[PDB]
RNA sequence: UUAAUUAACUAUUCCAAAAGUUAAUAACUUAACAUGGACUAGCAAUUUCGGUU
RNA sequence: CACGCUUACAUCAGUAACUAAUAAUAUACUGAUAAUUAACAACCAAUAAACCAAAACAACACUAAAACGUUUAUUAAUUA
RNA sequence: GUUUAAAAGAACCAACUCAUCUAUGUGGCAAAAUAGUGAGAAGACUUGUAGGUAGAGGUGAAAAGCCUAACGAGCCUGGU
RNA sequence: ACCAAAGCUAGCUCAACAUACUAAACAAAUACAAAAAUACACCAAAAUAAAAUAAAACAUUCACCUAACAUUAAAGUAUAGGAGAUAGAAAUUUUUAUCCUGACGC
């Protein structure tokens, strides 16, 4: 006895079946697509081919992403897409010596960052690379909207992105009811990331949260059979009246 | 040592363990430590009068049976509400906004023995 | 599972409350302190180390109370004394010559004149003479007498410079604090606690001291008569 | 941020398949430490008259500490992006005339 | 002073609200619809449950100042 | 309601009558209705066992039909 | 353990990171956390005890 | 009596054989039928305050400082 | 129970707790027993119920003892 | 002559197809000490794979070792190895549907 469908596609079959299929197709494709994250720890190489310094011949060199671990505490902050590097090393930088397991952790910082779109100061545990990415993107909300999920790797960042996208799509007057001119000035400088409302509330959602939201949207009480019977009787009476 | 196949009952335990066999509670504990029984929790067996009831626990063997026809919602509707609804529609007094006069109930919390929460035992 | 502490009592109570001792066991369950356990059943008497504590905030002036009775306390080495002030009683640490039916004063008024130092008096360090013996001293104004409490132990006030009190502890170390730290003048009761002679091994089991292990361990570098210089003066004045 | 590199080379897989990693492929060497490299300067355009940096409408390079703790949170300066640089350019063009 | 309360034995403070509750203008997706806990969802904050019908035995105790005999001048009984 | 207990199985959990809501009951709160990351292995094992049972039952039926056909050549 | 390789953790110390302070590029401090690289010791981790006699 | 085993307990019938370390027969096997009835026991108030002062015939004491309790005000569905 | 102003980690000696010596037993009554004979027996005492400390460890009035009949470090499964 | 021996069946094993994968029973009770209807909450947790083998030892290393891309070749090639044991690609090539499935398996 063997499995007709391998175990590697059971998740895809569960997505194409069940209530997972009733999800919006844009969210389904956003979850299906697998973009390689940006190199955060490993230093990548430029060209695909390289001359072997010992053999003096061309050989194809492929970049291998180093597996990184994200602790659950990283989801409460914005570490810029990094985490714990679990690996091995050779003490004294000598191969002939012993092998020692090592856990490299990023230097965490308790920092307060102010956002323009939401107008709130969040005390987020960010790191130096996070601050450098912010200053490179020239704005906190700019960085949030430009870096995708594969680069953020933070549920907090995804929630920030979804919230600010919903605000930009709905044009919430609650931002500055006292200064509509300032509200419009803030909204105009982010008009390149405008996403319609049909998709602005399906970016920062996980699988279980999306399933729960779809269940809440599809939850309806069962219609009593008396209504169906009365409808059928009215239809039959109309047919009998028109056939005469 | 001990057993794991027999059912864990009230007799296989110490004094501090007294599990009920499955009876339904009929009250609570009072003030001085006694048990106060509530007359609203005890089942009031509603038994009718069987004096002028002309029916026996058995039937005549010569009596013929009937075809197995389970009662369904459509047949119940056709027997109960269809005539009145058809008469009202023929007369022109049919109202899709109010169907309570035909037997339909909007909610269940209005009457005593509701159907979905199943307030009555039997 | 994890053990729960017995110290769940927010309200102050004059009557002794019950306590559950634990011999070297932390909240985990492993032995962390060797040589504790198997003691006699003891109660706990709540002690208010904050001496100057007014009953009502309306009249924060210095107040006088009367000693009721000096009893023994099994938790610590010193003897406790119940003192009533206003409408409430409290257990405090009795001084050397504190007897039944005595007067205790609690004041915080600092004055240019030195105040007569009694035994029951509780005045700030700045108002006391420069050569007195005190006990139950404090660290910060309004923190609590965490320091000397043992029977017979007493520190000595050395000098007061630039609004700052300097004391010498029983460990011959200097402690620099603010002059608003309330302290009790005199020596602690039961000055003969060191002269006691445990008659038999049973008294240690009664007090709750299990015997040491029998593993013969060779002496290391730690052993020997080390003559160390006196540690520096410990200061609590947060200088800007 | 730490930068690590593998000791043993990983065999190639050019048909879109994932590389077949092994136990010995976890041996990492710390080839570079980002926090130890010389820090760069942050360039910002002032929106007010700062005593230390200069007058309003000037681009200055300050250290990242002050740039992230003093100028941006207090609104004393904004980023040097071209979108905000165009505003300062048009302000200078309108100022130098009248 | 010295507070007579112990942090380990006191009632613990409720956990910090999830990061979804700090997003202005966004309804968090909780497990209040399934009437049971599931990991990955947000913590639903429930309103103060009010027993519309007064139950004698299982209700809270009314305050001292609510009673009609409550007076300002304290009496030493 | 169709619930998924800690054992990975799908059960039809009935509802009980309670005077308090679901978020204030001590007995109902400490119940777990979800699958842990260690239960998928046992779920797959049970699936494999049931598939094996069905497969060997099918093989038994097939062989019994073969035996009956070889015993009664009425065709 | 005075054998050969040297872990993780805990108490030292130093440097880098971060928070900052002064003046016309320069000097200085680290409450509780807290990362990486070096230093001193415990707790210790793996391995072995050449052959003819 | 508490803890633990659950019918091995009681009546009738049989033991050629099965269990008793052997016979007789039978509380220890077989088959059938019945059984332990609550007053004893289990579960069977909180909310704040007044409450320092040992049990040892406890008069009153020693040190190793000692388990075991009432009253007051508001709420404890009220009905074999 | 007796001596004792004593409930003195006092003394004689019961229930009780250990196991000094000898004799049977060594596939025995018993995978540690019986008989005779011993020490403690108001305390560093025995014991009922219930909870905790779990093996790179727990615990230990150090025997390298005990951790469900084999402990120089328990048992089961997996690598096998 | 006792004790005794003999049946051919219950059924399994290997695969191919395959709906597309936690069967049926779920009246009431079932994570209080499971099958106990019934009261003011609490709910959750991750942190590399190790060695037993080989190198006649054993420290760097030792295919798989419960992670998908399959097959014909390149090829056991380049390479990685106390350069020892051993490990080991890639670029680039081939693969035409269905039924004909039962058993030189007990
Ligand atoms: Mg058993
Ligand atoms: Mg019982
Ligand atoms: Mg019993
Ligand atoms: Mg009754
Ligand atoms: Mg004492
Ligand atoms: Mg003590
Ligand atoms: Mg000693
Ligand atoms: Mg010794
Ligand atoms: Mg290929
Ligand atoms: Mg050495
Ligand atoms: Mg060793
Ligand atoms: Mg090793
Ligand atoms: Mg060794
Ligand atoms: Mg040798
Ligand atoms: Mg030899
Ligand atoms: Mg010789
Ligand atoms: Mg038995
Ligand atoms: Mg017989
Ligand atoms: Mg019988
Ligand atoms: Mg004696
Ligand atoms: Mg001897
Ligand atoms: Mg004997
Ligand atoms: Mg004799
Ligand atoms: Mg004797
Ligand atoms: Mg003697
Ligand atoms: Mg006696
Ligand atoms: Mg070892
Ligand atoms: Mg050990
Ligand atoms: Mg020894
Ligand atoms: Mg020895
Ligand atoms: Mg054993
Ligand atoms: Mg090994
Ligand atoms: Mg070898
Ligand atoms: Mg060999
Ligand atoms: Mg291996
Ligand atoms: Mg080399
Ligand atoms: Mg060699």
PDB file of C-alpha atoms in Angstrom, chain C residues 59-224:
ATOM      1  CA  UNK C  59      -1.426  65.180  61.833  1.00  0.00           C
ATOM      2  CA  UNK C  60       2.052  64.058  60.701  1.00  0.00           C
ATOM      3  CA  UNK C  61       3.740  65.514  63.790  1.00  0.00           C
ATOM      4  CA  UNK C  62       6.018  63.529  66.093  1.00  0.00           C
ATOM      5  CA  UNK C  63       4.054  61.085  68.215  1.00  0.00           C
ATOM      6  CA  UNK C  64       4.419  59.266  71.529  1.00  0.00           C
ATOM      7  CA  UNK C  65       3.343  55.673  72.184  1.00  0.00           C
ATOM      8  CA  UNK C  66       3.406  53.327  75.174  1.00  0.00           C
ATOM      9  CA  UNK C  67       5.017  49.898  75.423  1.00  0.00           C
ATOM     10  CA  UNK C  68       2.557  47.155  76.356  1.00  0.00           C
ATOM     11  CA  UNK C  69       4.675  44.024  76.762  1.00  0.00           C
ATOM     12  CA  UNK C  70       8.046  42.684  75.617  1.00  0.00           C
ATOM     13  CA  UNK C  71       7.781  39.077  74.424  1.00  0.00           C
ATOM     14  CA  UNK C  72      10.075  36.559  72.778  1.00  0.00           C
ATOM     15  CA  UNK C  73      10.029  36.069  69.006  1.00  0.00           C
ATOM     16  CA  UNK C  74      11.079  32.719  67.470  1.00  0.00           C
ATOM     17  CA  UNK C  75      11.728  34.114  63.979  1.00  0.00           C
ATOM     18  CA  UNK C  76      14.656  36.386  64.887  1.00  0.00           C
ATOM     19  CA  UNK C  77      17.223  36.507  67.677  1.00  0.00           C
ATOM     20  CA  UNK C  78      15.881  39.670  69.332  1.00  0.00           C
ATOM     21  CA  UNK C  79      12.830  40.135  71.547  1.00  0.00           C
ATOM     22  CA  UNK C  80       9.756  41.899  70.195  1.00  0.00           C
ATOM     23  CA  UNK C  81       7.649  44.508  71.977  1.00  0.00           C
ATOM     24  CA  UNK C  82       4.013  45.395  71.351  1.00  0.00           C
ATOM     25  CA  UNK C  83       3.451  49.160  71.337  1.00  0.00           C
ATOM     26  CA  UNK C  84       0.091  50.898  70.908  1.00  0.00           C
ATOM     27  CA  UNK C  85      -0.261  54.354  69.393  1.00  0.00           C
ATOM     28  CA  UNK C  86      -3.540  56.100  68.686  1.00  0.00           C
ATOM     29  CA  UNK C  87      -6.023  53.414  67.635  1.00  0.00           C
ATOM     30  CA  UNK C  88      -3.577  50.767  66.373  1.00  0.00           C
ATOM     31  CA  UNK C  89      -0.926  48.464  67.823  1.00  0.00           C
ATOM     32  CA  UNK C  90       2.309  47.256  66.276  1.00  0.00           C
ATOM     33  CA  UNK C  91       5.224  44.935  66.994  1.00  0.00           C
ATOM     34  CA  UNK C  92       8.632  46.630  67.085  1.00  0.00           C
ATOM     35  CA  UNK C  93      12.140  45.547  68.049  1.00  0.00           C
ATOM     36  CA  UNK C  94      12.641  46.351  71.727  1.00  0.00           C
ATOM     37  CA  UNK C  95      15.885  48.010  72.792  1.00  0.00           C
ATOM     38  CA  UNK C  96      18.107  46.878  75.670  1.00  0.00           C
ATOM     39  CA  UNK C  97      16.306  48.393  78.678  1.00  0.00           C
ATOM     40  CA  UNK C  98      12.798  48.445  77.183  1.00  0.00           C
ATOM     41  CA  UNK C  99      10.424  47.113  79.850  1.00  0.00           C
ATOM     42  CA  UNK C 100       6.658  46.923  80.230  1.00  0.00           C
ATOM     43  CA  UNK C 101       4.919  50.254  80.715  1.00  0.00           C
ATOM     44  CA  UNK C 102       7.455  52.581  79.097  1.00  0.00           C
ATOM     45  CA  UNK C 103       7.245  55.627  76.830  1.00  0.00           C
ATOM     46  CA  UNK C 104       8.528  55.646  73.237  1.00  0.00           C
ATOM     47  CA  UNK C 105       8.862  58.781  71.106  1.00  0.00           C
ATOM     48  CA  UNK C 106       8.949  58.835  67.296  1.00  0.00           C
ATOM     49  CA  UNK C 107      10.062  62.129  65.748  1.00  0.00           C
ATOM     50  CA  UNK C 108      11.462  63.338  62.432  1.00  0.00           C
ATOM     51  CA  UNK C 109      12.055  67.018  63.269  1.00  0.00           C
ATOM     52  CA  UNK C 110      15.672  68.012  62.591  1.00  0.00           C
ATOM     53  CA  UNK C 111      16.832  70.963  64.671  1.00  0.00           C
ATOM     54  CA  UNK C 112      19.986  72.959  65.271  1.00  0.00           C
ATOM     55  CA  UNK C 113      19.909  71.733  68.891  1.00  0.00           C
ATOM     56  CA  UNK C 114      20.907  68.199  69.830  1.00  0.00           C
ATOM     57  CA  UNK C 115      18.100  66.093  71.303  1.00  0.00           C
ATOM     58  CA  UNK C 116      18.451  63.980  74.441  1.00  0.00           C
ATOM     59  CA  UNK C 117      19.130  60.412  73.302  1.00  0.00           C
ATOM     60  CA  UNK C 118      16.977  57.905  75.186  1.00  0.00           C
ATOM     61  CA  UNK C 119      16.594  54.199  74.398  1.00  0.00           C
ATOM     62  CA  UNK C 120      13.021  54.219  73.109  1.00  0.00           C
ATOM     63  CA  UNK C 121      13.507  57.412  71.112  1.00  0.00           C
ATOM     64  CA  UNK C 122      13.438  57.267  67.308  1.00  0.00           C
ATOM     65  CA  UNK C 123      14.903  60.441  65.783  1.00  0.00           C
ATOM     66  CA  UNK C 124      16.722  61.095  62.494  1.00  0.00           C
ATOM     67  CA  UNK C 125      20.494  60.821  62.438  1.00  0.00           C
ATOM     68  CA  UNK C 126      21.079  64.532  61.848  1.00  0.00           C
ATOM     69  CA  UNK C 127      19.444  65.427  65.170  1.00  0.00           C
ATOM     70  CA  UNK C 128      21.403  62.918  67.247  1.00  0.00           C
ATOM     71  CA  UNK C 129      24.701  63.565  69.057  1.00  0.00           C
ATOM     72  CA  UNK C 130      27.895  62.696  67.209  1.00  0.00           C
ATOM     73  CA  UNK C 131      28.909  59.855  69.531  1.00  0.00           C
ATOM     74  CA  UNK C 132      25.772  57.785  70.091  1.00  0.00           C
ATOM     75  CA  UNK C 133      24.976  54.094  69.668  1.00  0.00           C
ATOM     76  CA  UNK C 134      22.022  53.312  67.399  1.00  0.00           C
ATOM     77  CA  UNK C 135      20.322  50.367  65.712  1.00  0.00           C
ATOM     78  CA  UNK C 136      17.619  49.568  63.150  1.00  0.00           C
ATOM     79  CA  UNK C 137      19.034  52.182  60.790  1.00  0.00           C
ATOM     80  CA  UNK C 138      17.641  52.826  57.316  1.00  0.00           C
ATOM     81  CA  UNK C 139      19.028  53.228  53.805  1.00  0.00           C
ATOM     82  CA  UNK C 140      16.738  55.845  52.225  1.00  0.00           C
ATOM     83  CA  UNK C 141      14.135  58.176  53.779  1.00  0.00           C
ATOM     84  CA  UNK C 142      10.941  56.131  53.866  1.00  0.00           C
ATOM     85  CA  UNK C 143      12.429  52.806  52.730  1.00  0.00           C
ATOM     86  CA  UNK C 144      12.571  50.684  55.886  1.00  0.00           C
ATOM     87  CA  UNK C 145      15.088  49.531  58.499  1.00  0.00           C
ATOM     88  CA  UNK C 146      16.745  46.800  56.448  1.00  0.00           C
ATOM     89  CA  UNK C 147      20.007  47.077  58.427  1.00  0.00           C
ATOM     90  CA  UNK C 148      21.045  46.022  61.927  1.00  0.00           C
ATOM     91  CA  UNK C 149      18.381  44.059  63.823  1.00  0.00           C
ATOM     92  CA  UNK C 150      20.163  41.209  65.640  1.00  0.00           C
ATOM     93  CA  UNK C 151      20.119  40.895  69.417  1.00  0.00           C
ATOM     94  CA  UNK C 152      22.912  42.893  71.035  1.00  0.00           C
ATOM     95  CA  UNK C 153      24.152  44.306  67.724  1.00  0.00           C
ATOM     96  CA  UNK C 154      24.396  48.083  67.453  1.00  0.00           C
ATOM     97  CA  UNK C 155      26.133  50.599  65.215  1.00  0.00           C
ATOM     98  CA  UNK C 156      27.767  53.860  66.247  1.00  0.00           C
ATOM     99  CA  UNK C 157      27.275  57.300  64.716  1.00  0.00           C
ATOM    100  CA  UNK C 158      30.650  58.768  63.712  1.00  0.00           C
ATOM    101  CA  UNK C 159      30.185  62.212  62.140  1.00  0.00           C
ATOM    102  CA  UNK C 160      27.800  64.395  60.141  1.00  0.00           C
ATOM    103  CA  UNK C 161      29.169  66.524  57.292  1.00  0.00           C
ATOM    104  CA  UNK C 162      27.401  68.442  54.500  1.00  0.00           C
ATOM    105  CA  UNK C 163      23.979  67.131  55.487  1.00  0.00           C
ATOM    106  CA  UNK C 164      25.034  63.485  55.489  1.00  0.00           C
ATOM    107  CA  UNK C 165      25.220  60.924  58.294  1.00  0.00           C
ATOM    108  CA  UNK C 166      28.072  58.433  58.695  1.00  0.00           C
ATOM    109  CA  UNK C 167      27.700  55.312  60.833  1.00  0.00           C
ATOM    110  CA  UNK C 168      29.930  52.375  61.738  1.00  0.00           C
ATOM    111  CA  UNK C 169      28.251  48.972  61.488  1.00  0.00           C
ATOM    112  CA  UNK C 170      28.973  45.899  63.641  1.00  0.00           C
ATOM    113  CA  UNK C 171      31.152  44.674  60.750  1.00  0.00           C
ATOM    114  CA  UNK C 172      33.405  47.720  61.357  1.00  0.00           C
ATOM    115  CA  UNK C 173      32.377  49.186  57.987  1.00  0.00           C
ATOM    116  CA  UNK C 174      31.360  52.789  57.355  1.00  0.00           C
ATOM    117  CA  UNK C 175      27.940  53.578  55.888  1.00  0.00           C
ATOM    118  CA  UNK C 176      27.108  57.016  54.472  1.00  0.00           C
ATOM    119  CA  UNK C 177      23.424  57.963  54.183  1.00  0.00           C
ATOM    120  CA  UNK C 178      21.114  60.965  54.367  1.00  0.00           C
ATOM    121  CA  UNK C 179      20.307  62.532  57.727  1.00  0.00           C
ATOM    122  CA  UNK C 180      16.564  61.918  57.254  1.00  0.00           C
ATOM    123  CA  UNK C 181      17.016  58.155  57.744  1.00  0.00           C
ATOM    124  CA  UNK C 182      15.140  57.323  60.944  1.00  0.00           C
ATOM    125  CA  UNK C 183      16.997  55.079  63.389  1.00  0.00           C
ATOM    126  CA  UNK C 184      16.467  53.785  66.920  1.00  0.00           C
ATOM    127  CA  UNK C 185      18.898  54.919  69.620  1.00  0.00           C
ATOM    128  CA  UNK C 186      20.502  52.304  71.855  1.00  0.00           C
ATOM    129  CA  UNK C 187      21.313  48.608  71.782  1.00  0.00           C
ATOM    130  CA  UNK C 188      18.979  45.765  70.842  1.00  0.00           C
ATOM    131  CA  UNK C 189      17.522  43.608  73.606  1.00  0.00           C
ATOM    132  CA  UNK C 190      18.858  40.185  74.633  1.00  0.00           C
ATOM    133  CA  UNK C 191      22.549  41.081  74.683  1.00  0.00           C
ATOM    134  CA  UNK C 192      23.374  37.586  75.996  1.00  0.00           C
ATOM    135  CA  UNK C 193      22.472  35.708  72.803  1.00  0.00           C
ATOM    136  CA  UNK C 194      26.132  35.080  71.948  1.00  0.00           C
ATOM    137  CA  UNK C 195      26.950  33.791  75.452  1.00  0.00           C
ATOM    138  CA  UNK C 196      24.394  30.976  75.175  1.00  0.00           C
ATOM    139  CA  UNK C 197      25.600  27.369  75.219  1.00  0.00           C
ATOM    140  CA  UNK C 198      23.680  24.812  73.167  1.00  0.00           C
ATOM    141  CA  UNK C 199      23.540  21.879  75.559  1.00  0.00           C
ATOM    142  CA  UNK C 200      22.977  19.026  73.116  1.00  0.00           C
ATOM    143  CA  UNK C 201      22.522  18.210  69.445  1.00  0.00           C
ATOM    144  CA  UNK C 202      18.758  18.266  69.991  1.00  0.00           C
ATOM    145  CA  UNK C 203      18.530  22.050  70.200  1.00  0.00           C
ATOM    146  CA  UNK C 204      19.860  22.398  66.645  1.00  0.00           C
ATOM    147  CA  UNK C 205      17.147  20.044  65.382  1.00  0.00           C
ATOM    148  CA  UNK C 206      14.604  22.047  67.383  1.00  0.00           C
ATOM    149  CA  UNK C 207      15.751  25.330  65.828  1.00  0.00           C
ATOM    150  CA  UNK C 208      15.794  23.722  62.379  1.00  0.00           C
ATOM    151  CA  UNK C 209      19.484  23.138  61.625  1.00  0.00           C
ATOM    152  CA  UNK C 210      20.220  19.792  59.999  1.00  0.00           C
ATOM    153  CA  UNK C 211      23.793  18.512  60.432  1.00  0.00           C
ATOM    154  CA  UNK C 212      26.493  18.979  57.827  1.00  0.00           C
ATOM    155  CA  UNK C 213      27.411  16.336  55.276  1.00  0.00           C
ATOM    156  CA  UNK C 214      30.069  13.736  55.980  1.00  0.00           C
ATOM    157  CA  UNK C 215      31.982  14.048  52.702  1.00  0.00           C
ATOM    158  CA  UNK C 216      35.553  14.767  53.799  1.00  0.00           C
ATOM    159  CA  UNK C 217      36.638  17.636  51.539  1.00  0.00           C
ATOM    160  CA  UNK C 218      40.276  18.707  51.431  1.00  0.00           C
ATOM    161  CA  UNK C 219      40.875  22.371  52.209  1.00  0.00           C
ATOM    162  CA  UNK C 220      41.582  24.525  49.168  1.00  0.00           C
ATOM    163  CA  UNK C 221      43.005  27.974  48.588  1.00  0.00           C
ATOM    164  CA  UNK C 222      40.038  29.622  50.303  1.00  0.00           C
ATOM    165  CA  UNK C 223      41.127  28.382  53.732  1.00  0.00           C
ATOM    166  CA  UNK C 224      43.574  30.304  55.893  1.00  0.00           C
TER     167      UNK C 224
END
